[PDB]
Amino acid sequence: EEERSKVDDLRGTPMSVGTLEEIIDDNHAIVSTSVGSEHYVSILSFVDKDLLEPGCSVLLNHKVHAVIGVLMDDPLVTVMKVEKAPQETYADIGGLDNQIQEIKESVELPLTHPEYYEEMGIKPPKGVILYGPPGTGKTLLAKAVANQTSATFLRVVGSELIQKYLGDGPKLVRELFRVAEEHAPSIVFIDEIDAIGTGEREIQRTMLELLNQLDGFDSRGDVKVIMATNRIETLDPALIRPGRIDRKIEFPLPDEKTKKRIFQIHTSRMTLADDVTLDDLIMAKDDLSGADIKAICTEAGLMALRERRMKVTNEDFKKSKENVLYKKQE
């Protein structure tokens, strides 16, 4: 007890918050601050030195800077990937059975059903790269959801995580590469790839560095990376040969029949009336994704649920369809 309450002199009044740079095997690490003060002192208790992940903020002192402990602190990492197993499988959507068996056969052959993968002796640990014109997570997460059935998943949505802060660099990509290293049986999913589409000079070099580290120049077959953008013209031609090397496919235009199937899947569990017609619903829409029709199915199930009924009438589903007609036109 006294030995635990005797180191209080170091963590007392002379205490500061610095930024550690790296850990040296010589048990004296190098720290930094606003002016970059480098002090090396033998380590003490209360530190982990393994999960510390150097390059973050640590605890310093006004003294010779003997490290008395560490203090953890990133909320943006939590919203990166989902850790749940959704019930949406590859057999819940139709029409694109070949388009979904191309990626299912592409990334479900490594690490699962390995007699057609390891006996050949190829191992292209790069994965396919797709793009959905509607996107909005619906089509790209409806194609990536096939791997989410029974497997660990890794999700990355939007290039905002790089642009919402100062140019720290590819260190976040190194964090995804070390959590993917410790989570090798996973699927890397990069969504909403609009880095160059949205300083600007650093975005190109952290994107080309993203291409460098994504290529896997020192790592063996560890994880399958599946990228997903919205516009194929935004990506530069240099991100192709070191990037998409396995296979790519095209997605058809969802005008009437793909929206009829999306409407059937979004209206398979719910109960609708007999007078609910389909031609006006697949006619009034124009280049719409599944998030807004899911939004009007949610507010239509709740609005029809206001009368303590689960049946969605035709006039109430047109009244909810006015949200679709207005939202895309606003």
Partner 1 sequence: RDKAPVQPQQSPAAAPGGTDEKPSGKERRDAGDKDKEQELSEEDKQLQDELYRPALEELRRQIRSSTTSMTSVPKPLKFLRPHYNKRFAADIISVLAMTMSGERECLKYRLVGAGEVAKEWQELDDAEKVQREPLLTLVKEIVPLLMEIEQVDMLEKDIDENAYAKVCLYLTSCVNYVPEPENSALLRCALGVFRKFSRFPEALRLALMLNDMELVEDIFTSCKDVVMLGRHGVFLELSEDVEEYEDLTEIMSNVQLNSNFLALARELDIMEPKVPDDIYKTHLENNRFGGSGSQVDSARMNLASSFVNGFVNQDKLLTDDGNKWLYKNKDHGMLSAAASLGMILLWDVDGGLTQIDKYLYSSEDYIKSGALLACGIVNSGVRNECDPALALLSDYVLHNSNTMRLGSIFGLGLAYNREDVLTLLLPVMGDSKSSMEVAGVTALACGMIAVGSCNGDVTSTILQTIMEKSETELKDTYARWLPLGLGLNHLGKGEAIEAILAALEVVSEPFRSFANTLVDVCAYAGSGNVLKVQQLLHICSEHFDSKEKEEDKDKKEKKDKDKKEAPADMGAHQGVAVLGIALIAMGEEIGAEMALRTFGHLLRYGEPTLRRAVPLALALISVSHDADPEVSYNSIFAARLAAMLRQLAQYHAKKGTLTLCPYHSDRQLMSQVAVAGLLTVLVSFL
3 state SS of 188: strand
**How is residue 42 annotated by DSSP?**
B
Q: Which stretch binds partner 1 (CB under 8 A): 110-118, 172-180, 206-214, 311-319?
A: 110-118
Window of 26-34, 144-152, 170-178, 263-271 that interacts with partner 1 by CB under 8 A:
144-152
Identified binder of partner 1 from the candidate list 101, 112, 264, 277, rule CB under 8 A: 112
Residue carrying the six token digits 């398979």:
268
Q: Is 132 annotated as a binding residue?
A: yes
Q: What are the respective helix, strand and coil percentages of the chain, to the nearest 5?
A: 30, 10, 55
Is 135 a known ligand-binding residue? yes
Among 184, 232, 305, 310, binds partner 1 (CB under 8 A): 184
Q: Report in angstroms the alpha-carbon separations of 25 from 20, 42, 297.
A: 15, 11, 59
Q: Which of 183, 111, 175, 132 is nearest to 154 (CA)?
A: 183
Indicate left, alpha or beta for 202 from its phi (over 0: left) and psi (-120 to 50: alpha).
alpha
Is residue 82 a contact residue for partner 1 (CB under 8 A)?
no
Query: What is the secondary structure of 230-286 as a DSSP string?
Result: S-TTTS-GGGTTTT--S--------SSHHHHHHHHHHTSSSEE-TT--STTHHHH--
How big is the site for partner 1, counted in residues (CB under 8 A)? 8
Number of helices and strands in the chain (H, E): 10, 9
185 binds partner 1 (CB under 8 A): yes
Looking at 88-96, 109-117, 127-135, 162-170, which segment touches partner 1 (CB under 8 A)?
109-117
Site membership for partner 1, residue 151 (CB under 8 A): yes
Structural tokens at position 287: 């280049």
Comparing CB distances to partner 1, the nearer of 147 and 267 is 147
Smaller CB separation from partner 1, 25 or 115: 115
Query: Which window, 19-27, 149-157, 192-200, 259-267, contacts partner 1 (CB under 8 A)?
Result: 149-157
Q: Which of 5, 150, 268, 329 binds partner 1 (CB under 8 A)?
A: 150
Q: How far is the CB of 114 from partner 1 (least distance, A)?
A: 9
133 is in an annotated binding site: yes
Give the binding range for partner 1 (CB under 8 A) out of 145-153, 187-195, 250-258, 272-280. 145-153
121 marked among binding-site residues: no
Q: Is 111 in the site for partner 1 (CB under 8 A)?
A: yes
Task: Give the type of residue at 224.
Answer: K
From residue 10 to residue 49, what is the string marking binding to partner 1 with x (rule CB under 8 A)? ----------------------------------------
Q: Is 137 annotated as a binding residue?
A: yes
Least Å distance, CB 178 to partner 1, is: 12
Enumerate residues 6+ apart whose C-beta is below 8 A from 151: 112, 185, 186, 187
How many beta carbons lie within 10 A of that of residue 23, not counting itself? Answer: 18
Give the footprint of partner 1 on this chain (CB under 8 A): 111-112, 115, 150-152, 184-185
